[PDB]
């Protein structure tokens, strides 16, 4: 029947337990959706080219120019950390776990609700809204992964976080190929560079329509579609860092003579002329055996060519790097490259009693050094004479081709067959979950926006879209906007997504780091006096561990 | 139930493949239809007769003299090529598969929506439109094809070619007998030529009613129809062309002296006096052996009268041929009889943003042989002497009647017990699928509107209809006009075609012709930036193959 | 994911592009440039990188002699231009057994 | 090296219609769009016409409507339909080619560059 | 919409002379000038492209420049065979069009 509920709002995390020191952690989430109808029923292939700012000689990182298929379906996604756990469950996660699994994800829509809109033409503007009970949801789910990967995540704009607000779903659409051609410049430049837009080559064009390629489920007020259970085959995560970098693997050198007092100024000393020692170095032309010049196991992190950008027939793209600066936790103006920047709104953390249209944005720095800092590397001479004299030295701050902004680290990549690295790490609320594996025959060993990748497939993307509420004046010869009595849904999503974790033990005396609630962040849990809702970021990998 | 929807849309085209290079193709396609109540709940019996173009002396060829019944149903047809295939499956289709069978057909009707509209008469206007869940939408199967056949693809009325477009249903209408007279004449023919029309004779009056002929289901909001899978017997069809004509049929003449080296002029030579020569020839009584001369097992194609009109009671029609002129590849103006012409609107292929009434046309250059060139025919004495005469050849130049631009080629005809042709191709998307065999003791050879022609039956016209919602004020005395309730229906059309193919091999070492996407019609496949789609004409016997 | 287009072409020609519609210091997203709050097509985070940069026509020697550093793939939009065939995409010499 | 040939042009009576044919060799005559060019004697110069690979068109204002153009790319060869001639019309017509690669309706018929043909000549009069 | 350029200009051989050309933000300010030398008689060869590079052949005398809503052409090292009518070149952005100059002649002294 029409009054019957199809389905139950739950929005519990349950943290089950089992046998060796595993648990259980079940995420439920329910939103309610605001679904308006499209501007058009038809799909639209468009181009955005931004000539205007691209123009101006040394702006050529802000290079817009795509192509996109815009299309009338709708994109619901709860692919990010926000969308399942509250603050107090991260913070049981992170303090009391140590390695993360995600076993299954589940969905479904229920309490579907269509509206109309209709309008009183009187003087004073008035309108009324009246139900449908006959028209129906369009709801496809692409379970074989045919249609293209669009991760809301990544623009925020992945339902809302807080389960007592309502949400939207994201508009849909995905690249179309294209061709691009920006050569860079900087202020100074003589002329204006070429900077053109060259087309789609043909071999290449992929146009997708989910009328074509999914079922679609058309939902009445009275009916409900479920997803069923999917199975994950992700790679384990690990929600401790690791402090140690190449100075710090393997057995400290015998410190002959210790202090005797404590101080600060109260150092030891290792007693043995460096040239005289004793063990291994790489360095097979000199005696020197230091801290810097042993022989380690291996590398940790590697220098990758930052503020890199590479072009390819899309235009440019700035090189992806694992990790960013280490010891820059201090200052968020030192985070450089690679610590991911997050911009979000009001429906995913921003203050929501909050005006205007500036983003809310944080920088993510990570508690793990796997990273370099640059200031400090040095390039010298094989012959290894020391002290080393100028010409026997490329130093961070001797200029590459005479820019004397841009130095050696700039253009200089150590990424090797020694390389160790670890993964990306969780970021709440605004990170995304999971993503999906590359289509491609050779692929990477870590994507930066995911902690989880999928070995094989993973779940379909769910499309939802108001069903044409045509008018009596249809005429489909007609090349005029077709005209649509105007009509919104609002409907009830719940999904459950299934981890599977471990608690952590204690290895070390000392007590660990933990994430807390403390006066300096209190009221950044609690409601305002006037409702205000607002999510700040928390680490991930709080905990520490033993690399080697 | 009110609130519950009574079916699933899909379009999807899924291959799947059998043992010995078999593939099943089952075509989803799934419509939004939109139906207005009919302008009159009464049959019309209704002639046309536009005396006034055919009193232009010479204009009879424009003749449109005629008489119909108009019905107040609506009929849904589904019978072309565009309403089940996408330019993808379409290419995959022709690309890959040697033959078509046509096997099963199987729609339904479903989630049924009515709604009512109401003015209010306001200064500024505005109108309302309201659900009516007790009106019922009215439809009949013709499962026994007791209602004349009338496939909507002749006249571009048939289904929308695309998932995400509303399409309407074709009113229906059929003819009723009638008797026209139509002399014909050229311009400056005295007088007015003999033209008159004298209507119906009294043993060929057939008024078919659907009450009274077909079961009629009444479909509320919350019903569904179904129409069960009916099976096809046609005979096989073929993907593939036959490039062959009689002067390529047989073993062709040994060359004793065969070309030395490259080029366009250095031909090889037979080297045997013709009337020397060794073979056989169906000429009795000539010593000549040439490769026009020599006798070829039977003959492909034939020669027909071309823009020939013939009369009988109805009034004149064009005399239908199964192939076109020859040569046409070379030149598209010089196709005309034979090879079809398509004039269709937007729902059907023309660019869904263009202006005007004018459709898009296109003519249909198939690539099979078969036809004539009539201009390098000729007829000569029997005697048989050479290099023939003026008073023993008629060329096609040569006048005919005392008139210069009909020759004998345009009354020639030479269709005979040796001659052998083809069936006509699928034209995507604007052909027709499968046609109705005539109920004649003897049976044409074949249809050339359709691929496929049923030997016992083929599926029943669904015809729909707006059950009438009267008002208040209702006299079954009147003579005035009824007063219903302005009402109109959006109900879901879906329907499976399942075909059988096979798949093709490679007979040759070169490739073959092919469809494919090329930086010319690229942007025929995607949709404009404002939306705009368009689908084009696509050819169906790429793959060539060997008659004899 | 594309970016969302707050503003849509309204007639169909070469110059009716799309426009973004947000300045760009006041975009949502997500970036791997900490120091920066412009989010561009070109500094918006990706999964991974998708082909590599190579030292090209690069010689290295070992004991045997100097040998030129192969490389996975060529130039990017070589199909258009000929003369733009460069690094990566092989180039074949062959005689009559052989085409 | 690129090479551009042109021909068709004429002396022709006011309104009627005119005809002209450019031929190209030398380069990837579909990657590249084609535009005509004019200049009357001894005045300036004033674009006619582009047309893009895909058969996409464009015109000037003094012709828009007035003339078609299009392309042959299995011949090398552009069309220019010069319907509805006036006086005015009377120049000297260029064939050229734009320097970089192009195809589809978002793209600009001629930026920069061309290796000109040596032109044909028209006049309108009675 | 079209360019501005001045009707003539003189320099004495062996000398460097300049050339103007302005526009507005549309043609000139997005998209730089295109220099088109025409020699007597004769269909126009280019000089200097926007990208401010010169094709195969041209002498090194040619150089260009831009700025704002105008550009300019110079020539160092003028010669007799310089004498000739010059041409600016742009796109104007919102008619989507090729808009060229009014034209300049050269004269060598």
């Known amino acids: 029947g029409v009054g019957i509920s199809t389905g139950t709002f739950n929005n519990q995390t349950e943290f089950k337990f089992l046998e060796n020191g595993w648990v259980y952690i079940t995420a439920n989430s329910s939103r309610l959706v605001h679904l308006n109808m499209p501007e058009s029923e038809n799909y639209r292939r468009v181009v955005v080219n931004n000539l205007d700012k691209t123009a101006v000689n040394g702006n050529m990182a802000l290079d817009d120019t795509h192509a996109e298929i815009v299309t009338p379906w709708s994109l619901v996604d709860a692919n990010a950390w926000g969308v399942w756990f509250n603050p107090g469950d991260w913070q049981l996660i992170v303090n009391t776990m140590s390695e993360l699994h995600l076993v299954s994800f589940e969905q479904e829509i229920f309490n579907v609700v269509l509206k109309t809109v209709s309008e009183s033409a009187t003087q004073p503007p008035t309108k009324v809204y009246n139900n449908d009970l006959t028209a129906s949801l369009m709801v496809a789910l692409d379970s074989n992964n045919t249609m293209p990967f669009t991760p809301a995540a990544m623009r925020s704009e992945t339902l809302g976080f807080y389960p007592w607000k309502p949400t939207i779903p994201t508009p849909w659409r995905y690249y179309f190929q294209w061709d691009r051609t920006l050569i860079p410049s900087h202020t100074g430049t003589s002329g204006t560079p070429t900077n053109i837009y060259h087309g789609t080559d043909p071999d290449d064009v992929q146009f997708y329509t989910i009328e074509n390629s999914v079922p679609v489920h058309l939902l009445r007020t009275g009916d409900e579609f479920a997803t069923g259970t999917f199975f994950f085959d992700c790679k384990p995560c690990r929600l401790t860092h690791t402090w140690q970098t190449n100075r710090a693997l393997g057995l400290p050198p015998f410190l002959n003579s210790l202090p005797q007092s404590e101080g600060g100024t109260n150092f030891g000393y290792i007693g043995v002329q460096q040239d005289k020692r004793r063990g291994v170095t790489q360095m097979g032309n000199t005696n020197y055996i230091t801290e810097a010049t042993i022989m380690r196991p291996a590398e940790v992190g590697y220098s990758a060519p930052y503020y890199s950008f590479e072009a390819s027939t899309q235009g440019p793209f700035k090189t992806p790097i694992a990790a960013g600066r280490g010891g820059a936790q201090t200052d968020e103006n030192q985070a450089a490259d690679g610590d991911p920047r997050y911009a979000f709104g009001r429906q995913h953390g921003q203050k929501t009693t909050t005006t205007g249209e500036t983003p809310e944005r944080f920088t993510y720095i990570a508690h793990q050094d796997t990273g370099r800092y640059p200031e400090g590397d040095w390039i010298q001479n094989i012959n290894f004479n020391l002290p080393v004299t100028d010409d026997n030295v490329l130093l961070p701050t001797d200029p590459i081709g005479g820019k004397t902004g841009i130095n050696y680290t700039n253009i200089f990549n150590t990424y090797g067959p020694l390389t160790a690295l670890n993964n990306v790490p969780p970021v709440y609320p605004n990170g995304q979950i999971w993503d999906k594996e590359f289509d491609t025959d050779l692929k990477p060993r870590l994507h930066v926006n995911a902690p989880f990748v999928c070995q094989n497939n993973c779940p379909g993307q769910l499309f939802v879209k108001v069903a044409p509420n045509l008018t009596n004046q249809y005429d489909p010869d007609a090349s005029a906007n077709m005209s649509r009595i105007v009509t919104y849904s609002d409907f009830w999503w719940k999904g459950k997504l299934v981890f599977k974790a471990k608690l952590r033990a204690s290895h070390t005396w000392n007590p660990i780091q933990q994430m807390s609630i403390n006066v300096d962040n209190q009221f950044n849990y609690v409601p305002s006096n006037i409702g205000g809702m607002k999510i700040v970021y928390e680490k991930s990998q709080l905990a520490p561990r033993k690399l080697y | 139930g009110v609130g519950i929807s009574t079916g699933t849309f899909n379009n999807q085209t899924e291959f799947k493949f059998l043992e010995n290079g078999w593939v099943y193709i089952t075509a989803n396609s799934s419509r939004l239809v939109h139906l207005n109540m009919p302008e009159s709940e009464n049959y019309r019996r209704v002639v046309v007769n536009n005396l006034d173009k055919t009193a232009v002396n010479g204009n009879m060829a424009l003749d449109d003299t005629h008489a119909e019944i108009v019905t107040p149903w609506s009929l849904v047809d589904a019978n072309a090529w565009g309403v089940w295939f996408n330019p993808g499956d379409w290419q995959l289709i022709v690309n890959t598969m040697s033959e078509l069978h046509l096997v099963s057909f199987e729609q339904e009707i479903f989630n049924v929506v009515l709604k009512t509209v109401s003015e209010s008469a306001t200064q500024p206007p505005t109108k309302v439109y309201n659900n009516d869940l007790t009106a019922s939408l009215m439809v009949a199967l013709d499962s026994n094809n007791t209602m004349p056949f009338t496939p909507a693809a002749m006249r571009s009325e048939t289904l929308g070619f695309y998932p995400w477009k509303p399409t309407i249903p074709t009113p229906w209408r059929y003819y009723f007998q009638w008797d026209r007279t139509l002399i014909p004449s050229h311009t400056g023919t005295s007088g007015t030529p003999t033209n008159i029309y004298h209507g119906t004779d009294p043993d060929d009056v057939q008024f078919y009613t659907i009450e009274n002929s077909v079961p009629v289901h009444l479909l509320r909001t919350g019903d569904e129809f179904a129409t069960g899978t009916f099976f096809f017997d046609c005979k096989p069809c073929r993907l593939t062309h036959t490039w062959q004509t009689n002067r390529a049929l047989g073993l062709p003449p040994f060359l004793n002296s065969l070309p030395q080296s490259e080029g366009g002029t250095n031909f090889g030579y037979i080297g045997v006096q013709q009337d020397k020569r060794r073979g056989v020839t169906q000429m009795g009584n000539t010593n000549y052996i040439t490769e026009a001369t020599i006798m070829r097992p039977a003959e492909v194609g034939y020669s027909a009268p071309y823009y020939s009109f013939e009369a009988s009671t109805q009034g004149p029609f064009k005399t239908p041929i199964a192939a076109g002129r020859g040569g046409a590849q070379t030149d598209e103006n010089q196709a005309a009889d034979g090879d079809p012409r398509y004039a269709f609107g937007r729902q059907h292929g023309q660019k869904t943003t263009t202006t005007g009434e004018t459709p898009e046309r296109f003519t249909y250059i198939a690539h099979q042989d078969t036809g004539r060139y009539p201009e390098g025919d000729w007829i000569q004495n029997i005697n048989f002497n050479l290099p023939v005469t003026d008073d023993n050849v008629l060329l096609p130049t040569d006048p005919i009647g005392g008139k210069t631009g009909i020759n004998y080629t345009n009354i020639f005809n030479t269709y005979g017990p040796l001659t052998a042709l083809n069936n006509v191709p699928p034209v995507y998307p604007n052909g027709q699928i499968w046609d109705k065999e005539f109920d004649t003791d003897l049976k044409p050879r074949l249809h050339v509107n359709a691929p496929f022609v049923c030997q016992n039956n083929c599926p029943g016209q669904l015809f729909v209809k707006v059950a009438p919602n009267l008002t208040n004020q209702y006299d079954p005395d009147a003579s005035a006009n009824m007063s219903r309730i302005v009402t109109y229906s959006d109900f879901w059309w879906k329907g499976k075609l399942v075909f059988k193919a096979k798949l093709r091999a490679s007979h040759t070492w070169n490739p073959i012709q092919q469809m494919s996407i090329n930086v010319d019609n690229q942007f025929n496949y995607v949709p404009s930036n404002i939306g705009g789609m368009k689908i084009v004409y696509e050819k169906s016997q790429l793959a060539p193959r060997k008659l004899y | 994911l594309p970016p969302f287009l707050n503003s849509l072409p309204q007639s169909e020609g070469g110059t009716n592009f799309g426009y973004i519609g947000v300045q760009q210091d006041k975009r949502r997203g997500v970036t791997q440039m900490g120091n920066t709050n412009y989010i561009t097509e070109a500094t918006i985070m990706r999964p991974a990188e998708v082909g590599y940069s190579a030292p090209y026509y690069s010689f290295e020697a070992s004991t045997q002699g100097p040998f030129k550093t192969p490389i996975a793939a060529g130039r990017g939009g070589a199909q258009t231009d000929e003369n733009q065939a460069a690094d990566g995409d092989p180039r074949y010499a062959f005689g009559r057994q052989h085409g | 090296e690129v090479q551009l040939v042109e021909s068709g042009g004429d002396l022709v009576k006011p309104a009627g219609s005119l005809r002209l044919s450019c031929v190209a060799s030398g380069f990837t005559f579909s990657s590249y769009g084609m535009n005509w060019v004019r200049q009357a004697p001894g005045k300036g110069l004033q674009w006619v016409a582009g047309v893009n690979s895909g058969g996409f068109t464009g015109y000037a204002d003094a012709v828009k409507g007035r003339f078609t153009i299009s392309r042959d790319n299995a011949k090398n060869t552009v069309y220019l339909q010069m319907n509805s001639l006036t006086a005015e019309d009377t120049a000297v017509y260029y064939c050229?080619?734009?320097?970089?690669?192009?195809?589809?309706?978002?793209?600009?018929?001629?930026?920069?560059?061309?290796?000109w043909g040596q032109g044909t000549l028209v006049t309108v009069s009675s | 919409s079209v360019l501005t350029q001045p009707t003539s200009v003189s320099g004495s051989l062996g000398q460097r002379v300049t050339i103007s050309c302005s526009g507005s933000t549309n043609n000139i300010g997005i998209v730089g000038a295109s220099w088109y030398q025409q020699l007597p008689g004769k269909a126009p060869k280019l000089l200097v492209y926007?990208?401010?590079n010169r094709p195969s052949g041209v002498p090194d005398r040619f150089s260009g420049s831009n700025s704002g809503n105008s550009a300019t052409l110079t020539i160092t090292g003028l010669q007799a065979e310089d004498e000739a009518d010059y041409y600016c070149?742009?796109?104007?952005?919102?008619?989507?069009?090729?808009?060229f100059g009014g034209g300049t002649h050269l004269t060598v002294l």
């Open positions: 050229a080619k734009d320097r970089y690669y192009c195809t589809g309706d978002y793209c600009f018929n001629l930026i920069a560059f061309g290796y």
């Open positions: 926007s990208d401010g």
């Open positions: 070149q742009s796109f104007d952005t919102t008619l989507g069009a090729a808009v």
